[PDB]
Each structure stands twice: as structure tokens, then as C-alpha cells.
Design a protein around this ligand. Structure first.
Ligand SMILES: *[C@@H]1O[C@H](CO)[C@@H](O[C@@H]2O[C@H](CO)[C@@H](O)[C@H](O)[C@H]2NC(C)=O)[C@H](O)[C@H]1NC(C)=O
Ligand SMILES: *[C@@H]1O[C@H](CO)[C@@H](O[C@@H]2O[C@H](CO)[C@@H](O)[C@H](O)[C@H]2NC(C)=O)[C@H](O)[C@H]1NC(C)=O
Ligand SMILES: O=C1C[C@@H]2OCC=C3CN4CC[C@]56c7ccccc7N1[C@H]5[C@H]2[C@H]3C[C@H]46
Ligand SMILES: O=C1C[C@@H]2OCC=C3CN4CC[C@]56c7ccccc7N1[C@H]5[C@H]2[C@H]3C[C@H]46
Ligand SMILES: O=C1C[C@@H]2OCC=C3CN4CC[C@]56c7ccccc7N1[C@H]5[C@H]2[C@H]3C[C@H]46
Ligand SMILES: O=C1C[C@@H]2OCC=C3CN4CC[C@]56c7ccccc7N1[C@H]5[C@H]2[C@H]3C[C@H]46
Ligand SMILES: O=C1C[C@@H]2OCC=C3CN4CC[C@]56c7ccccc7N1[C@H]5[C@H]2[C@H]3C[C@H]46
Ligand SMILES: *[C@@H]1O[C@H](CO)[C@@H](O)[C@H](O)[C@H]1NC(C)=O
Lengths: 206, 205, 206, 205, 205
């Protein structure tokens, strides 16, 4: 209690919040998806709804401490409002993303942060052929809304979407689900933009 | 008024809020459900909606006081924003949980806290067989979102879900409802996670 | 303007907010309902939606003042956030209550407060038989969420729900509407809890 | 920039917000509606949905300044949170009113304020006869929620609702739309209440 | 980190926020739309839903800095709450606009700001004829809610709406989409108001 209180006071009250990365001091953010459910499909609007956990990890020098100086504390939990978080956004959502979990992050003594919001997302997807044996493929890109590849580098720990928590009695079964880093250039602008392309192949079950 | 004002000032203004548990100083949180209604079932999306009260109890040394020092006050009510509260979350919700009651907790002189949010929850459930006599069983786990079993231990006072306030004219009748502590390990994570599994067997009326 | 500004400053900035009642210093809260409309019925979910005004009144010594000391002001209006308000809640709602009026209360020099939120409420009600001549009866209890009868006493000024503002062209006509104080005990806990039971008998029009 | 910053600092940081009117110092608020669209009708619930702009004007001595003292500034725009605003409310809404415009007001050197929220409103209305040539008439009163006629006087600049921005391809055409000051007493209350009654006659194509 | 922290502290903590433009010091805001999808059409209410990115650009002297003084930083990203933003609003929305992107802007050393909110908008549109080969045309104006043309000038970089990100498998195909500056006068008021008129011609695929 007392040690943790002192640590949080030192990290958060005695210094300003991290202002985000720059060209000079870029930040790597790792993303991974855990797909829980394809909740619904809307063939009249071509919108599909997913529920997933989006794991985000990054590391800041300003969040480092020595466990010996603070009662051997190697990590703690704190409100996501206490710290900077990356602006990772679905590019083709049709509704505001709905948050299903509390906004709390885990901070480790090496300055690494793990933040894993559960979300429900409606996104642009033609579900025609979902009732067939081949099923249907849909895709949605996630990236920083305003940081280029010079400020934020996105990576994945794996190209496989974690399906170990997928709901066994969903209306839809997953045939494949991948998460792939893409570099993108746009005609206006010189700098590269990074996204992770979440590609899901699915169909109605049996 | 004056005594209570002084107590709240001492507990909340004159010291920092409890920062949450650690490996060294873990916290036990007791959970209990009162199921009020199965409001609806959606066979096109496999989502079911429940209304329930979720009682949460825990105890902190930092919330202790001597009643004699504060006008014989043995307990008080306060906004949940004034205190730390646990991050207990349904694992398989499909919509943000909707809160139906005001966010107020009861604090007792021994440092124990009782907080009982009424909630409406949409969660993943295949309702196939709800129209049958056998009915259907659905389950949803509740636990801390980011604290492991090393920091937060969950328990129940009983394995029976309180059904005494269940809505008599619901579209669905309850055949059974249980609440059971589970210890879980994951491929992701080395540390154990504790949840309470709410299992409800029901059918159409 | 100047006198009222000074009064509000004295009551709200120069002292802490009332911390709520206790066993030693209980508070009586008077409730009355004005039923405006039965807006809808849902026979697939057994939910009914009402629109009403819920008048709440109570009195605090801490909100007293002498009109002579403050430019002859006998009352004022203020945001409900400036003052303590009771945690009166429907026991059997199925959705969060929707507030239709601004959150403003009237405070009188004797310390009495009048707060009258207009609300739309979805609550548990089987509407089977609403299309019949006998109609249907539904009920919903309102009480403090966490204060017992030792801290908050609820009363009504009358057992009749005010129907003078009921919408003349509603889909549903009201046969009766009553509001009755009840004392209740629950198996766990020694202390009594007070509620007001709103009972409404209605049917389809004409 | 610099002059305006100084003016806002003098008006808002150097003095308290206006606390609202009293019996001794009543306030006149002028209302006017611009009806944009009758968006929908629900004959199963007797709810109708309108989109309109509600112009509100009032004048306070505390918001006066001399333009010469502040770089010739005769008016400025500011967040509605910086100032007091009246609690004008539809009496027969069935859903919380939805705000479609940013909450910003215009303040003029004579202390006059203009605030014009665009809103979508669902209100109690039987639409039976909307498909006929005569159409249907519906009405909704707007007034202060908690100030009586002793504290706030409402007026209109005109009895005609502005229809110049009405959506030409709406599902519903407007036959007439009026806005009329009414004085009212209630069984509850000794003091008179002022409202503006918005009466709209409309029909399908 | 350290240089950027100092820059933000200098710009945002050590001086007041920009209070908005005046007649004396007007501001030009450039708008451009990127239409992503016509998501739905409602022929029972004459409402259509679009998803788009609205790029907004303006320039303030108060946001200028010398890169040499701050570690060669030529630009940074910051929360839109840290800075003033224009009150650009759709004139004919039927629901509050839904924001799909985080509220973050890019600020450049010359004081220029780029802010690009992704939005879902329901607006007044008769979709009769959408199933035909000619299709249907709908329009919606965007402008400042309370600043006139004397305080805020709107312009476009181009009259063509960017369709390069339009969703290939939308139910609706775009025949044309234009964005055009308009000057407007209103009977009440002496001052001109500027808007950008977004005109979209589309049909079923
Ligand atoms: C924090 O942890 C370190 C070890 O992980 C502790 O340091 C050791 O304490 C043991 C047991 O008393 C000694 O025998 C070792 O010599 C110490 N050093 C090392 C490097 O192992 C330390 O005492 C812990 N601190 C607290 C307050 O619990
Ligand atoms: C409060 O009320 C008293 C009277 O009840 C006001 O004082 C009187 O003011 C009138 C003019 O309005 C004078 O002619 C009287 O001589 C005053 N009498 C006394 C005893 O003071 C007083 O002005 C009121 N306060 C206000 C309006 O702020
Ligand atoms: O030109 C583009 C299109 C592209 O759209 C998909 C979403 C993206 C997320 N943000 C939103 C704005 C954007 C951007 C920034 C700077 C120049 C061009 C540009 N955009 C989008 C772009 C990506 C990346 C970035
Ligand atoms: O990927 C998972 C699966 C599992 O999901 C059920 C809920 C859990 C409670 N919290 C939420 C995040 C989670 C966790 C932490 C770190 C990596 C992966 C991960 N999760 C969930 C997990 C448990 C434990 C933990
Ligand atoms: O045990 C209960 C059930 C009962 O539910 C109906 C509604 C009530 C209003 N509040 C909500 C919490 C509650 C309460 C307080 C303390 C211990 C148990 C307890 N609850 C509910 C109770 C009443 C009274 C009170
Ligand atoms: O009983 C009523 C009905 C009537 O409703 C129309 C609107 C009004 C404006 N405010 C809102 C609350 C109200 C009022 C005050 C005290 C007791 C009952 C009561 N109401 C409304 C009333 C008027 C006047 C007042
Ligand atoms: O008289 C009007 C109608 C017109 O409506 C289209 C939208 C507009 C954008 N803002 C919103 C308020 C408004 C305006 C300013 C001052 C008095 C009246 C008034 N309005 C609207 C007007 C334009 C311009 C401006
Ligand atoms: C900034 O640019 C100058 C000029 O090239 C260079 O000398 C300096 O090292 C750069 N970096 C910093 C942090 O000032």
C-alpha cells in the first residue's frame, strides 16, 4: 500500500505525462487480437459486428523504476487515464467502438505497459456467402489515427489471431483469422503509415 | 452531520486513495448474484440479456475507524468514486454493461465495504432448446480484468444464486442458477486467474 | 444577483456538502408521482415504458438562511450537483432510467428542497390482457438503494398518483394508479427498508 | 486575441457566474423555433420526432462592457458552460432531447446573449389522420422546468414558426406551425407558469 | 520526450488557449471530405447515413515555434482538447453525429493544425429513385454554428470529394460527389454565413 502509493506519486504527480513519440524518439507498439465472437451480420447494410480483446504493448523510460527502491514491487495496475495510450483505431468502423472492459493497464518496472481493452466493433463487410460452405472473408485495418511510421511502428507478436477464447456456440464458425502488418503510402504525403490488417474468414455453423 | 463530515474528511482528504492490491498484500473480494429477470433471448445472434444485482464485499485497513472517536458512527454511505472498487467484469459480454442503480457503497468501521450495482448484461449464449421442457443452460464468468489470483482472490458466500427477487411473470422460468469459484490458467499468462462462473438453466414459460 | 450570488457562495463554497443521513439524524423524503404516459408495451420481453415526474422533497438545517440577511430572498434554483440528493431508485427497471428534464432543484429559506426529475422508465411488466376490458395491472417499487429505514424514511402526501397531466391521446387509458408506502425486510439483514409501490392498472384505449 | 482574452478574463474569472433570476429581479427570455423536419411518426406509441433550432435570447447587466475599453469588440462567441443558460424544456418529451449543434453562445456588449441549440425531440402526439388531406395537429409546450412566471417571463418575437428552412423532401408537409405564449396554473402550485406552445399541423404526401 | 514536453508546456500551460476569431482577426478554415460509405437509407423517414473523414485545417500564430529552440521538432500530435477547434456542424443532421476516431490533431511549427475526425452522420435525404439507373442526389451543408463569414472563412482545396477510400462492396455506388463553398444570407441577420455544400449522387449497386 505505502510503497505502491509512493511509486505512483513519484511516477504520476512528480512529473508530466509522456507527450507521445516523435521522429527523433519513435515508439514501437505491439498489437494482438483475441477474437471472442462474430456476434452478428447485417446483409441489408453490409456491417458485421465482432467482439475481441485488443492487446497493446509499449515501453517508456519515464515509467521505469528499481523494485529495491519501492518494496520489491515489480508491477502495478493503474487507470489508463493516468498514462499516455496509443491512438489505434479501426479504419472502416461504421459505429463508435464500444468498450466492454474497465480502462486499466498493467505497468512493469522495466517501463513496459500492457493494455487490453475488450471491444465490440461494427465494420464494413459484405456477408454474402456466409451461409455457404466456402463462407465469407472480411477485413479491417487497425492503425494510428495521426502518427506515421516515423513516430509509431506497429508490430504483431504473431500473424495468427488468437482463437483460443472463441465462443464455441457462436452462430458463426471461424475458418481462418490473421493479423498482418502493412506499410502504406498515400499520394499526398511522403511518410509511411503502418496498419495491422485483421482478415477473418467465417461461415454459419453446420 | 458534523461527526460524519469529520470522518469522511479524515478517510478521504487526509490520505491517498487505496492504490489496489499486490502480491505482498492481496485482497479477497466476495461476490454474490441476485437474478431478477432474463429479459430477452436472441437466437439470431446468440445473445441473452439478464438483469441482476451483483453484491461485492471486501475489507481495507485504510477504511477502519473507532466509532467512539466519531460520535458512535459504525457505518456510512458514500459515492463509489470516493473509494477504490474492484474491476470485476463479465468475460463474455457483447455490449457494455448498463448500470441500473446509483454508484454508492456502504462502508463499516471494521473497514469492510459493500457495493451492490444493479446491472443489465448482454452475453454470449446459444438459446437453442429454450422452448423445450429440459430448457437451456448458459454460463458467464465474472472476474478481475487485470488482477491475477496473486492480487485478488474471489470467493462466494454460497453456490446458490439468490432467486427470491426473480420476476414471477418473466418470459423465462429458472430451473437452476449457481455461482461457483473457478481457478483458471491460460496459454497467454503464467499466473492463475480467479473467476466466479454464473450458470443459469432456464426455459420459456 | 449579488445577494443570491453571496447566498450560494455561503451555502456551497464556504462549507462541505451534506454527507447524507445517519441513524442519529434520519431524513424524511416525500415522494409523489405524476404519470404522464404509458408510452409502450413489449409483450415479447414483458417490459413496459412509463413517462412520469417524480417529485422528491426533504429538508436540511444546513440549507437554512434568514431572508433579511440576503436581500429578502426566500428561495432559489440550483443545479442538483450543488446539493446532496437522495438515491431513490426503481427496483425492477430493465434499462437505465432516462432523464427528460434538466437536473435543477428549488431550495427554500427553511432548508426545504424540491426536486422533480421527469423520467422515462422501462420496467418488468407482463402486459397480457391489456387489450381486454378488465385491462392489466403492473407494479414497480421505488426506494433508496443503500439507506435503510433507520436513515431515510419515505412517505407520500397521498396514495393517489396524480393523473391530471396524463396524456389524453395515449394508446393506453388508466383505470387506477396508486402510490403506497411499504416496509420491507430482507433475510440477510436486520434493518427495515422503505419503498413506495407504484401500482398502475391500464388498458388499450376505445 | 489579446483584447478578447482580457474581456473574457474580466467577465468570467474575475466574478461569479450569474446565479439565475428571482422574484425581485426577474428575467425575460425570448424563444423562437425554426422547424427543419418532421422526421418520423409512430402510430403504435403515439410519438412524433421533430428536428428544430430553438433560439433563446436574454440580457444580463453582468455581461455588459464598453467596446472602447476592449479594442472595439462589440461581441464574442463562448462555450455555453462559461455562462448561465435557461432551463427551457419540452413538457411532453418521451426521450431525452438530443443536441445536434455545438454548445456555443454569442454575447453582445449590451449584455445580451443569443443561444440557438439544434435539437431532435420525440414527444407525445397521436398521428391518426396524418395520411388524410386535413392532416393532423400536434402540440408541445416549452418552458422553464423550475422557474415560475415570477422569475422567468417567456415571450416570442412572433407567433409564426420559421418554416423557411423546412426540408422540402420531408415525408411530411407542414400546413401550419405556430408558437404561442401561454400562462398556466396547476393544482400543485400557487404560482403561474409560462410556456410557449408549439402547435404543428402536418400531413403525409 | 523532454523537448516535446517542454514545447507542449510552453504552448499550452504558459499561455491561455486561443479564444476564437473576431472581425479584426478572422480565421480561414479549409475543409475536405473523404467519403467512405453510404451505410444506409431509410425511405420511411427520409434519412440517409454516411461515413466519412472530415479534414479540417487552420493556422494560428499562437501555435508557432522555432524547431531549433525545441530539439528540431517540426510537428507533434496532441489531444484536440488541448487546442481551440472550429465549430463546423452539419446543418441538416437528424441525430447527433457519431465520432469514429480519437480526438487528436497534428500541429506543425508554422502554427498550422490538421484535424481529421471520422464521423457517422444521419441527415435529411429523400432516397426515392436510388434503385433507378439515374440514381438520387442528396445534399448537406457544413458550416460554423455561430461564427459568421466576418470571423471564419471556409474554403475547400478542391471541389471533388475524395472517393479513393470509398468502400468497394457498399450497397450504394457513387455517381458523383462534390464539395462547394457557398455564401448565404438569412433574413434575421445582416452578416453573411459561409458553408460547404456536400452533394452526393448515388444509386444501388
Ligand atoms: C527483495 O528481493 C530480494 C531478492 O529477490 C531480497 O534480497 C535478498 O534477501 C535475502 C533474504 O533475506 C538475502 O539472503 C539475499 O542476500 C538478498 N539479496 C539477493 C540479491 O538475493 C530483498 O531482501 C527483498 N526485499 C524485501 C524488503 O522484501
Ligand atoms: C427588503 O425589504 C425591505 C422592506 O420590506 C426593503 O427595505 C425598504 O426599501 C424601501 C424601498 O424599496 C424603502 O422605502 C424602505 O424604507 C425600506 N425599509 C427598510 C426597513 O429597510 C429592502 O430594500 C429590501 N431589500 C432588497 C430589495 O434588496
Ligand atoms: O489519405 C489518407 C487515407 C487513409 O485512410 C485510412 C485511415 C487512416 C488513418 N489516418 C487517418 C488520416 C490518415 C492520413 C494522415 C495523413 C495523410 C493522409 C491520411 N489519410 C488517412 C489514411 C490512414 C492514415 C491516417
Ligand atoms: O487472452 C486472454 C484470455 C483470458 O480471457 C478471459 C479473461 C481474463 C481476464 N484478464 C483479461 C485479459 C486476460 C489476459 C492477460 C494477458 C494476456 C492475455 C489475456 N487474456 C485474458 C484472459 C483472462 C486473464 C486476463
Ligand atoms: O438483499 C437485497 C435484495 C433487496 O432487493 C430489492 C431492492 C432493494 C433496494 N436496495 C438495493 C440493495 C438492497 C440491500 C441492501 C443491503 C443488503 C441487502 C440488500 N438487498 C437489496 C434489497 C432492497 C434494499 C436494498
Ligand atoms: O404537476 C406538475 C405538472 C406541470 O407540468 C408542466 C410543467 C411544469 C413546469 N414545472 C415542472 C414541475 C412542475 C411542478 C412543480 C411542483 C409540483 C408539480 C409540478 N408539475 C410541473 C407542472 C409545471 C410547473 C412545474
Ligand atoms: O436563421 C437561421 C437559420 C440558418 O439555418 C441554417 C444554419 C445556419 C448555421 N448557423 C446556426 C444558427 C444560424 C443563425 C445565426 C444567427 C441567427 C439566426 C441563425 N439561423 C442559422 C442559419 C445558419 C447560420 C447560423
Ligand atoms: C538539431 O539539428 C542541428 C542542426 O543540424 C544539430 O546540430 C543538432 O544535433 C540536432 N539535434 C538536437 C537534439 O538539437
Amino acid at each position: 500500500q505505502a510503497n505502491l502509493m509512493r511509486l505512483k506519486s513519484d511516477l504520476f504527480n512528480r512529473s508530466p505525462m509522456y507527450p507521445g513519440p516523435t521522429k527523433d524518439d519513435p515508439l514501437t507498439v505491439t498489437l494482438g487480437f483475441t477474437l471472442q465472437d462474430i456476434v452478428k451480420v447485417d446483409s441489408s447494410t453490409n456491417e458485421v459486428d465482432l467482439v475481441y480483446y485488443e492487446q497493446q504493448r509499449w515501453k517508456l523510460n519515464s515509467l521505469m523504476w528499481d523494485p529495491n527502491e519501492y518494496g520489491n514491487i515489480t508491477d502495478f495496475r493503474t487507470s489508463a487515464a493516468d498514462i499516455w495510450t496509443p491512438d489505434i483505431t479501426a479504419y472502416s468502423s461504421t459505429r463508435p467502438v464500444q468498450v466492454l472492459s474497465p480502462q486499466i493497464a498493467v505497468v512493469t518496472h522495466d517501463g513496459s505497459v500492457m493494455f487490453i481493452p475488450a471491444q465490440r466493433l461494427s465494420f464494413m463487410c459484405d456477408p454474402t456467402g456466409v451461409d455457404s460452405e466456402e463462407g465469407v472473408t472480411c477485413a479491417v485495418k487497425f492503425g494510428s489515427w495521426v502518427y506515421s511510421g516515423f513516430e509509431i511502428d506497429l508490430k504483431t507478436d504473431t500473424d495468427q489471431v488468437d482463437l483460443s477464447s472463441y465462443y464455441a456456440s457462436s452462430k458463426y464458425e471461424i475458418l481462418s483469422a490473421t493479423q498482418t502488418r502493412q506499410v502504406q503510402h498515400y499520394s499526398c504525403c511522403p511518410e509511411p503509415y503502418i496498419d495491422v490488417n485483421l482478415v477473418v474468414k467465417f461461415r454459419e455453423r453446420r
